[PDB]
């Protein structure tokens, strides 16, 4: 058995969308407020996350069907999944060798301790790193990684979504494309689809914790003033 | 004739307030988004101006009597005079030799062309530089420069001020301190006080132009997203 031309088109469009929104040279990192290793890493991490939100918007806009949704559903999907898409996409810079995210030089090498310097606790950081390890160990094909981000983004079970039927139909088409890809293109991937669905569940707990910790930081005007307008709009509750 | 101990105290407090809020090493400049020489200088200039607003708040809080005003009057004074205080204080880095603002290396050397790269036009830039030249040529004593910033900040003729009587009384005390200082401490300064009052008038036209140009930039969400929360709050009209 094989995939249809429609399924092939979806994969090509998603891989193309990712290549357009993910820069392997990390050359834009020099434009952020520099990393400083109280809450010394906050300016750099805020600019890194703000930059990554723009990329996620860019990728989302190229997901087939996403642009056809109302502006409000697109916002609802983006607002609640952006941190999850960032966590998923960050896996491409994550290394099992040093348990850190390496984006070129040691300048842009992020460890747990650095994230602690933006105000985060081990309550988020330890499960984040365990998630990164587990996902890296899945050794996902670029096609799978890209399908997983798009599946995550198109979850109809998010607060504020209106056209739940349309979104769930878009996500299902993507899950079928994923199941068929693993089966046809991934040897030894018999248990893979299920493992990927579990990673999406893990992401909900990470999102939950991140939201709590962001709420705590953002409440203090001395730290909130260090954020960017886009971060305030996306992670903010003013929906 | 001489100054009273009260007048001496006011000058010492103002000079001390300025030394505490103005860093001659410009060492904090490396923490801003770097200068890029469309609208390439916007991130750096936004961070420079955001940093300078914090300094102006800091200086204002140490102006005798300012802290006794209501929070609302302090906001009204700060919101409409901050750009003028920035223009006045910038004169300390302005050089007649190169007609630019030199803050250490060529990294932090700002010319008219660089400000053009944050979206400004010659309508603001040419009168700004002419103001900088004229003010530098006044060869103000540190005591005079500091008195001029405090006089500017305590102008009761600003939109949104409530306790106009109190503010005008604070500013008058400062103008008397200034007039007496020039007379007693500045040789050849017979025409100086009047020249300084004219510079405050010049600042109103610069403020007027800056407000127009800021309104134009801030209306576009692609540039407004590059601003900092403090800049949006201070230069914004949401009073």
């Amino acid at each position: 058995h094989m995939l249809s031309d429609e399924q092939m088109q979806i994969i090509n469009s998603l891989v193309e969308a990712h290549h357009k929104t993910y820069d392997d040279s990390y050359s834009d990192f020099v434009r952020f407020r520099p990393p400083v290793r109280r809450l010394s890493m906050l300016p750099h991490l805020a600019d890194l996350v703000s930059y990554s939100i723009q990329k996620v918007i860019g990728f989302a806009k190229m997901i087939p069907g996403f642009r056809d949704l109302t502006a409000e559903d697109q916002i609802a999907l983006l607002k609640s999944s952006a941190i999850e898409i960032i966590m998923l996409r960050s896996n491409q810079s994550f290394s099992l060798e040093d348990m850190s995210w390496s984006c070129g030089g040691p300048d842009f090498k992020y460890c747990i301790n650095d994230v602690t310097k933006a105000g985060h606790t081990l309550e988020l950081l330890e499960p984040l790193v365990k998630f990164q390890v587990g996902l890296k160990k899945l050794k996902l094909h670029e096609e799978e990684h890209v399908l997983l981000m798009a599946i995550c983004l198109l979850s109809p079970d998010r607060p504020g979504v209106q056209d739940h039927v349309r979104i769930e139909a878009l996500q299902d088409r993507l899950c079928d494309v994923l199941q068929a890809y693993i089966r046809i293109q991934h040897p030894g991937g018999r248990l893979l689809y299920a493992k990927m669905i579990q990673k999406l569940a893990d992401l909900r707990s990470l999102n939950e914790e991140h939201s709590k910790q962001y709420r705590s930081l953002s409440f203090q005007p001395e730290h909130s003033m260090q954020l960017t307008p886009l971060v305030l709009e996306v992670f903010g509750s003013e929906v | 004739h001489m100054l009273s101990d009260e007048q001496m105290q006011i000058i010492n407090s103002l000079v001390e307030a300025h030394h505490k809020t103005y860093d001659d090493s410009y060492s904090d400049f490396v923490r801003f988004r770097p200068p890029v020489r469309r609208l390439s200088m916007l991130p750096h200039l936004a961070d420079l101006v955001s940093y300078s607003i914090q300094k102006v708040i800091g200086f204002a809080k140490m102006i005798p009597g300012f802290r006794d005003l209501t929070a609302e009057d302090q906001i009204a004074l700060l919101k409409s005079s901050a750009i003028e205080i920035i223009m006045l204080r910038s004169n300390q880095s302005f050089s007649l030799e190169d007609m630019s603002w030199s803050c250490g290396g060529p990294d932090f050397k700002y010319c008219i062309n660089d400000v053009t790269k944050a979206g400004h036009t010659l309508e603001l830039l040419e009168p700004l530089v002419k103001f900088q030249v004229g003010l530098k040529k006044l060869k103000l004593h540190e005591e005079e420069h500091v008195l001029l910033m405090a006089i500017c900040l305590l102008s009761p003729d600003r939109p949104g001020v409530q306790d106009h009587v109190r503010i005008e009384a604070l500013q008058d005390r400062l103008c008397d301190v200034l007039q007496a200082y020039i007379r007693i401490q500045h040789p050849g300064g017979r025409l100086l006080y009047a020249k300084m009052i004219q510079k405050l008038a010049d600042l109103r036209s610069l403020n007027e132009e800056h407000s127009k140009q800021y309104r134009s930039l801030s209306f576009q969400p692609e540039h407004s997203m590059q601003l900092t929360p403090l800049v949006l709050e201070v230069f914004g009209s949401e009073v």
């Binding site: 918007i57 806009k61 709009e233 003013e238 | 969400p221 997203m225």
Partner: peptide, 10 residues
């Protein structure tokens, strides 16, 4: 409001 989001979504 979502001024930035709307604009980025074009």
């Amino acid at each position: 409001r979502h001024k930035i989001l709307h604009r980025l979504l074009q």
